[PDB]
Design an enzyme around this catalytic site. Structure first.
Site, short mmCIF file in Angstrom:
data_model
loop_
_atom_site.label_atom_id
_atom_site.label_comp_id
_atom_site.label_asym_id
_atom_site.label_seq_id
_atom_site.Cartn_x
_atom_site.Cartn_y
_atom_site.Cartn_z
N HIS A 46 0.81 -1.23 0.00
CA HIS A 46 0.00 0.00 0.00
C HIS A 46 0.86 1.30 0.00
CE1 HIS A 46 -0.26 0.50 4.59
NE2 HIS A 46 -0.08 1.76 4.19
N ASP A 97 -0.72 -7.19 2.03
CA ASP A 97 -0.01 -5.90 2.19
C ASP A 97 1.48 -6.15 2.46
OD1 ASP A 97 -0.94 -2.80 3.97
OD2 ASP A 97 0.16 -3.16 2.10
N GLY A 196 2.26 6.70 8.49
CA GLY A 196 3.69 6.97 8.33
C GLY A 196 4.53 5.84 8.90
N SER A 198 3.52 2.71 8.47
CA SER A 198 3.19 1.60 7.55
C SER A 198 4.43 1.03 6.88
CB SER A 198 2.21 2.05 6.48
OG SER A 198 0.94 2.38 7.03
N1 LIG Z 1 -3.98 2.17 14.36
C1 LIG Z 1 -2.85 1.77 13.65
N2 LIG Z 1 -1.95 1.01 14.09
C2 LIG Z 1 -2.66 2.24 12.22
C3 LIG Z 1 -1.74 1.50 11.36
C4 LIG Z 1 -1.48 1.96 10.08
C5 LIG Z 1 -2.12 3.16 9.58
C6 LIG Z 1 -1.94 3.60 8.23
C7 LIG Z 1 -2.61 4.75 7.78
C8 LIG Z 1 -2.49 5.18 6.43
C9 LIG Z 1 -2.41 5.49 5.29
C10 LIG Z 1 -2.32 5.79 3.90
C11 LIG Z 1 -2.13 7.11 3.43
C12 LIG Z 1 -2.06 7.35 2.05
C13 LIG Z 1 -2.19 6.29 1.13
C14 LIG Z 1 -2.39 4.96 1.62
C15 LIG Z 1 -2.44 4.73 3.01
C16 LIG Z 1 -2.60 3.78 0.69
C17 LIG Z 1 -2.71 4.13 -0.82
N3 LIG Z 1 -2.99 5.55 -1.12
C18 LIG Z 1 -2.17 6.54 -0.37
C19 LIG Z 1 -3.47 5.50 8.67
C20 LIG Z 1 -3.67 5.07 9.96
C21 LIG Z 1 -3.01 3.88 10.44
C22 LIG Z 1 -3.27 3.40 11.75
#
Ligand SMILES: N=C(N)c1ccc2cc(C#Cc3ccc4c(c3)CCNC4)ccc2c1
Length: 246
Positions: A46, A97, A196, A198
């Site tokens: 992702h 993922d 961030g 991720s």
């Molecule tokens: N509660 C958590 N551990 C957790 C874990 C991972 C996370 C990840 C995100 C995110 C994101 C994101 C931001 C931009 C894009 C993508 C994903 C995927 C594809 N398009 C852009 C937001 C909250 C998150 C929260």
């Protein structure tokens, strides 16, 4: 990372800092990663699916700060960007993922292991830690959901693994979280991974060995009551990792 503590790369030497070059030459942080062998970094699909050009990415090993050239750090380009062919996103859940990045220095070399650059061991099949096990997460991700900037200094925290049956409860994630996914959170809901973080590691000490048990994948908000962090269960992906690094 919400809560937790500030850290340095010497405590997390498998941690890879991944950035993207934009048109015009500006560089911004994307996601975390983990060094699994000198030529290979593992992350989450992702993080790259919207910008799949390998030449755009910069990978650092041995970097402790977002905008500092940490002494002993190594800079690389991506020789091969491998995304999981069955990766997919639902409203909350991300499926398959997982991503692999083959890294190369400008001289055409892979990582040179050092005190601040080391690999992380992969898990064995059908041997993940039991629920309640404490595991660590690392990243340059948000300190608060309302922040738009990332912390300058690398952070870490410790969370507890949650069973699949507890994570499938109606107030948690129901049938949206699958057996290919691992839940982990703080019992007091004060510390967690966030946007961030991720692609970064969920490292568990299992039977005396530091293992890459999960990859930061998704979650409802950050550090919200009954809403754990959800991680790619790396042990399910061992045939896919072997085949794509051969
Ligand atoms: N509660 C958590 N551990 C957790 C874990 C991972 C996370 C990840 C995100 C995110 C994101 C994101 C931001 C931009 C894009 C993508 C994903 C995927 C594809 N398009 C852009 C937001 C909250 C998150 C929260």
């Amino acid at each position: 990372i919400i809560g937790g503590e500030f850290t340095t790369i010497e405590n997390q030497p498998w941690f890879a800092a991944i950035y993207r070059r934009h048109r015009g030459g500006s560089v911004t942080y994307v996601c975390g990663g983990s060094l699994i062998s000198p030529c290979w970094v593992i992350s989450a699909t992702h993080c790259f699916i919207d910008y799949p050009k390998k030449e755009d990415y910069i990978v650092y090993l041995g970097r402790s700060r977002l905008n500092s050239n940490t002494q002993g750090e190594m800079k690389f380009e991506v020789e091969n960007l491998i995304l999981h062919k069955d990766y997919s996103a639902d409203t909350l859940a991300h499926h398959n993922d997982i991503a692999l990045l083959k890294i190369r220095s400008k001289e055409g070399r892979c990582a040179q292991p050092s005190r601040t650059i080391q690999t992380i061991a992969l898990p064995s099949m059908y041997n993940d830690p039991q629920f309640g096990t404490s595991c660590e997460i690392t990243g340059f991700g948000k300190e608060q959901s309302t922040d738009y900037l990332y912390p300058e200094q690398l952070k870490m925290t410790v969370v507890k693994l949650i069973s699949h049956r507890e994570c499938q409860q109606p107030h948690y994630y129901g049938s949206e979280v699958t057996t290919k996914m691992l839940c982990a959170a703080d019992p007091q809901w004060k510390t967690d991974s966030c946007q961030g973080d991720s692609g970064g590691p969920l490292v568990c000490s299992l039977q005396g060995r530091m293992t890459l048990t999960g990859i930061v994948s998704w979650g409802r908000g950050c550090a919200l009551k009954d809403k754990p962090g959800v991680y790619t269960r790396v042990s399910h992906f061992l045939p896919w990792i072997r085949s794509h690094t051969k």
